Design an enzyme around this catalytic site. Structure first.
Site, PDB file in Angstrom:
ATOM      1  N   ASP A 108      31.354   6.551   0.270  1.00  0.00           N
ATOM      2  CA  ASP A 108      32.523   5.660   1.355  1.00  0.00           C
ATOM      3  C   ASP A 108      31.671   4.137   1.754  1.00  0.00           C
ATOM      4  O   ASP A 108      30.498   4.155   1.471  1.00  0.00           O
ATOM      5  CB  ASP A 108      33.006   6.599   1.939  1.00  0.00           C
ATOM      6  CG  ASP A 108      32.078   7.400   3.400  1.00  0.00           C
ATOM      7  OD1 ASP A 108      31.142   7.157   3.470  1.00  0.00           O
ATOM      8  OD2 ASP A 108      32.295   8.739   3.218  1.00  0.00           O
TER       9      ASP A 108
ATOM     10  N   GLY B  77      29.290  16.580  -7.640  1.00  0.00           N
ATOM     11  CA  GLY B  77      28.892  16.744  -5.777  1.00  0.00           C
ATOM     12  C   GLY B  77      28.013  15.754  -5.230  1.00  0.00           C
ATOM     13  O   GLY B  77      27.462  14.950  -5.734  1.00  0.00           O
TER      14      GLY B  77
ATOM     15  N   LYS C 180      41.638  14.820  -0.205  1.00  0.00           N
ATOM     16  CA  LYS C 180      41.295  14.949   1.162  1.00  0.00           C
ATOM     17  C   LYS C 180      41.902  15.782   2.104  1.00  0.00           C
ATOM     18  O   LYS C 180      43.002  14.856   1.824  1.00  0.00           O
ATOM     19  CB  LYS C 180      40.212  14.174   1.555  1.00  0.00           C
ATOM     20  CG  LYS C 180      38.384  13.397   0.521  1.00  0.00           C
ATOM     21  CD  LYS C 180      38.080  12.502   1.389  1.00  0.00           C
ATOM     22  CE  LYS C 180      36.643  11.931   1.368  1.00  0.00           C
ATOM     23  NZ  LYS C 180      36.191  11.651   1.775  1.00  0.00           N
TER      24      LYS C 180
ATOM     25  N   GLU D  73      38.716  10.087  -6.645  1.00  0.00           N
ATOM     26  CA  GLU D  73      37.932  10.185  -7.867  1.00  0.00           C
ATOM     27  C   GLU D  73      37.450  11.074  -7.968  1.00  0.00           C
ATOM     28  O   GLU D  73      36.614  11.224  -7.017  1.00  0.00           O
ATOM     29  CB  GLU D  73      37.671   8.782  -9.611  1.00  0.00           C
ATOM     30  CG  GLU D  73      36.124   8.229  -8.298  1.00  0.00           C
ATOM     31  CD  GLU D  73      35.560   7.345  -9.185  1.00  0.00           C
ATOM     32  OE1 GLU D  73      34.914   7.872 -10.252  1.00  0.00           O
ATOM     33  OE2 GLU D  73      35.258   6.269  -9.169  1.00  0.00           O
ATOM     34  N   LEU D  74      37.023  12.631  -9.190  1.00  0.00           N
ATOM     35  CA  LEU D  74      36.448  13.932  -8.832  1.00  0.00           C
ATOM     36  C   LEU D  74      34.633  12.638  -9.095  1.00  0.00           C
ATOM     37  O   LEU D  74      34.558  12.486 -10.491  1.00  0.00           O
ATOM     38  CB  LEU D  74      37.126  14.698  -9.653  1.00  0.00           C
ATOM     39  CG  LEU D  74      35.849  16.092  -9.251  1.00  0.00           C
ATOM     40  CD1 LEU D  74      36.091  16.070  -8.189  1.00  0.00           C
ATOM     41  CD2 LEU D  74      36.868  16.765 -10.963  1.00  0.00           C
TER      42      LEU D  74
ATOM     43  N   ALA E 285      32.699  15.327 -10.653  1.00  0.00           N
ATOM     44  CA  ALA E 285      31.962  16.573 -11.005  1.00  0.00           C
ATOM     45  C   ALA E 285      30.947  17.776 -10.855  1.00  0.00           C
ATOM     46  O   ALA E 285      30.494  18.444 -10.433  1.00  0.00           O
ATOM     47  CB  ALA E 285      32.310  16.488 -12.602  1.00  0.00           C
TER      48      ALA E 285
ATOM     49  N   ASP F  17      24.951   5.043   7.461  1.00  0.00           N
ATOM     50  CA  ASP F  17      24.325   6.145   6.997  1.00  0.00           C
ATOM     51  C   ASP F  17      24.011   6.823   5.488  1.00  0.00           C
ATOM     52  O   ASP F  17      24.294   7.999   5.088  1.00  0.00           O
ATOM     53  CB  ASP F  17      26.061   7.421   7.287  1.00  0.00           C
ATOM     54  CG  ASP F  17      25.211   8.964   7.522  1.00  0.00           C
ATOM     55  OD1 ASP F  17      24.170   9.236   7.017  1.00  0.00           O
ATOM     56  OD2 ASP F  17      25.951   9.826   7.997  1.00  0.00           O
TER      57      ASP F  17
HETATM   58  N1  LIG Z   1      35.473  12.687  -4.526  1.00  0.00           N
HETATM   59  C1  LIG Z   1      34.512  13.554  -4.305  1.00  0.00           C
HETATM   60  N2  LIG Z   1      34.159  14.403  -5.827  1.00  0.00           N
HETATM   61  C2  LIG Z   1      33.763  15.915  -5.668  1.00  0.00           C
HETATM   62  N3  LIG Z   1      33.773  16.247  -4.083  1.00  0.00           N
HETATM   63  C3  LIG Z   1      34.001  15.829  -3.304  1.00  0.00           C
HETATM   64  C4  LIG Z   1      34.229  14.205  -3.145  1.00  0.00           C
HETATM   65  N4  LIG Z   1      34.719  13.941  -1.839  1.00  0.00           N
HETATM   66  C5  LIG Z   1      33.716  15.065  -1.223  1.00  0.00           C
HETATM   67  N5  LIG Z   1      33.602  15.783  -2.058  1.00  0.00           N
HETATM   68  C6  LIG Z   1      33.137  16.947  -1.192  1.00  0.00           C
HETATM   69  O1  LIG Z   1      33.031  17.385  -0.467  1.00  0.00           O
HETATM   70  C7  LIG Z   1      32.204  17.088   0.759  1.00  0.00           C
HETATM   71  C8  LIG Z   1      32.289  16.143   2.279  1.00  0.00           C
HETATM   72  O2  LIG Z   1      33.415  14.937   1.525  1.00  0.00           O
HETATM   73  P1  LIG Z   1      32.417  13.294   1.862  1.00  0.00           P
HETATM   74  O3  LIG Z   1      30.881  13.571   2.345  1.00  0.00           O
HETATM   75  O4  LIG Z   1      33.237  12.093   1.816  1.00  0.00           O
HETATM   76  O5  LIG Z   1      33.147  13.741   3.940  1.00  0.00           O
HETATM   77  P2  LIG Z   1      32.940  12.737   4.968  1.00  0.00           P
HETATM   78  O6  LIG Z   1      33.426  11.260   4.785  1.00  0.00           O
HETATM   79  O7  LIG Z   1      33.713  13.463   5.718  1.00  0.00           O
HETATM   80  C9  LIG Z   1      31.415  13.235   5.626  1.00  0.00           C
HETATM   81  P3  LIG Z   1      30.395  11.853   7.372  1.00  0.00           P
HETATM   82  O8  LIG Z   1      31.868  11.816   7.677  1.00  0.00           O
HETATM   83  O9  LIG Z   1      30.016  12.931   7.102  1.00  0.00           O
HETATM   84  O10 LIG Z   1      30.089  11.044   6.517  1.00  0.00           O
HETATM   85  C10 LIG Z   1      30.785  16.257  -0.227  1.00  0.00           C
HETATM   86  O11 LIG Z   1      29.515  15.927  -0.098  1.00  0.00           O
HETATM   87  C11 LIG Z   1      31.388  16.733  -1.474  1.00  0.00           C
HETATM   88  O12 LIG Z   1      30.878  18.336  -1.543  1.00  0.00           O
HETATM   89 MG   LIG Z   2      31.393   9.196   4.444  1.00  0.00          MG
END
Ligand SMILES: Nc1ncnc2c1ncn2[C@@H]1O[C@H](COP(=O)(O)OP(=O)(O)CP(=O)(O)O)[C@@H](O)[C@H]1O
Ligand SMILES: [Mg+2]
Length: 282
Positions: free
Chosen positions: A165, A97, A45, A92-93, A95, A147
């Site tokens: 998260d 999505g 990130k 952690e990845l 894979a 959410d």
């Molecule tokens: N650990 C992970 N492994 C694989 N893809 C990931 C990942 N973390 C994020 N992604 C990718 O990035 C996108 C956005 O990440 P994430 O949903 O964690 O962001 P965010 O927490 O900012 C969202 P929001 O604020 O809208 O809740 C995910 O939909 C996915 O495609």
């Molecule tokens: Mg989120």
């Protein structure tokens, strides 16, 4: 924290994975980040350049919260780079999505069908339990998600589903009536959302209340209405959904109760990795 600090040199970015609220998230590789393995596949990130100082700070603080989580059913923090710019948060990845996207790829008309049939009843129960387990962990940690939805759940290489998260730091079609009404959020309103996730899973991620405007959904749900069962939805999942959608929040089950209801029908490995079966819950 220092224990979490990872040198920038160890991280290799490979490609964009998606947009986070703070910035682009990439797939990458990390050299010696996990004892026992030379290199780990990771999600990285970043915070967009257009971010304010305060947001760059909030970005790191969020990572700091995750340092306290060690649940197999919640996406784990592996390390962070806070020295210099740009700052990076290594997770952690997952894979496959986000869950929503994964579900839509299993649709017959999906231009990206992985070649397997939609999820089985068995796989759906496994998903439910894993999602419920992660939520129970968060709730035990005093976090109300706010959410929960398929888009906010992720799928690992072995198809294990995990909560992305600790929650949103809007989601009208996923909100409980009392949340829509009084704007109150509890683990019980998270249960309502959980039900919609199950609905999403059985409908292969269709849009909840398709046809209705956020204006109408708002009134519909507040009047006591809820989603119709997807076509040929397995009865067992329908019952879980119904429990989650009882108008009175005190009537909905807890995530721990969800897991308990499904414990005898899960993969053998479950008790070895679940929060439900861990000593942190007994
Ligand atoms: N650990 C992970 N492994 C694989 N893809 C990931 C990942 N973390 C994020 N992604 C990718 O990035 C996108 C956005 O990440 P994430 O949903 O964690 O962001 P965010 O927490 O900012 C969202 P929001 O604020 O809208 O809740 C995910 O939909 C996915 O495609
Ligand atoms: Mg989120």
């Amino acid at each position: 924290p220092d224990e979490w600090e990872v040198s920038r040199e160890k991280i290799t970015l490979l490609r964009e994975l998606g947009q986070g609220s703070f910035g682009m998230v990439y797939e990458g590789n990390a050299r010696d980040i996990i004892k026992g393995e030379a290199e780990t596949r990771v999600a990285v990130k970043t915070v967009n350049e257009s971010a304010s100082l305060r947001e760059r700070i909030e970005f790191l603080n969020e990572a700091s919260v995750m340092k306290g989580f060690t649940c197999h059913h919640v996406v784990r923090l592996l390390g962070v780079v806070s020295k210099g710019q740009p700052t990076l948060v290594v997770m952690e990845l997952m894979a496959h999505g986000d869950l929503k996207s994964y579900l839509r790829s299993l649709r017959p008309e999906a231009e990206n069908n992985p070649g397997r049939p939609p999820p089985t009843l068995q796989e759906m129960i496994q998903m439910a339990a894993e999602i419920a387990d992660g939520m129970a962990y968060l709730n035990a940690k005093k976090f109300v998600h706010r959410d929960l939805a398929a888009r906010n759940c992720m799928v690992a290489h072995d198809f294990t589903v995990k909560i992305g998260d600790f929650g949103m730091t809007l989601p009208v079609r996923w909100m409980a009536p009392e949340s829509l009404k009084d704007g109150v959020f509890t683990t019980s309103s998270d249960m309502w959302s959980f039900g919609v996730v199950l609905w999403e899973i059985t409908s292969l991620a269709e849009q909840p209340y398709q046809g209705l405007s956020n204006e109408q959904v708002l009134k519909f749900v507040m009047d006591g209405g809820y989603l119709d069962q997807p076509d040929n939805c397995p009865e067992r999942v329908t019952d879980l959904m119904r429990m989650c959608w009882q108008f009175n929040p005190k009537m909905r089950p807890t995530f721990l109760e969800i897991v308990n209801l499904l414990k005898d029908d899960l993969h053998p490995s479950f008790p070895e990795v679940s929060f439900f079966h861990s000593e942190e819950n007994k």
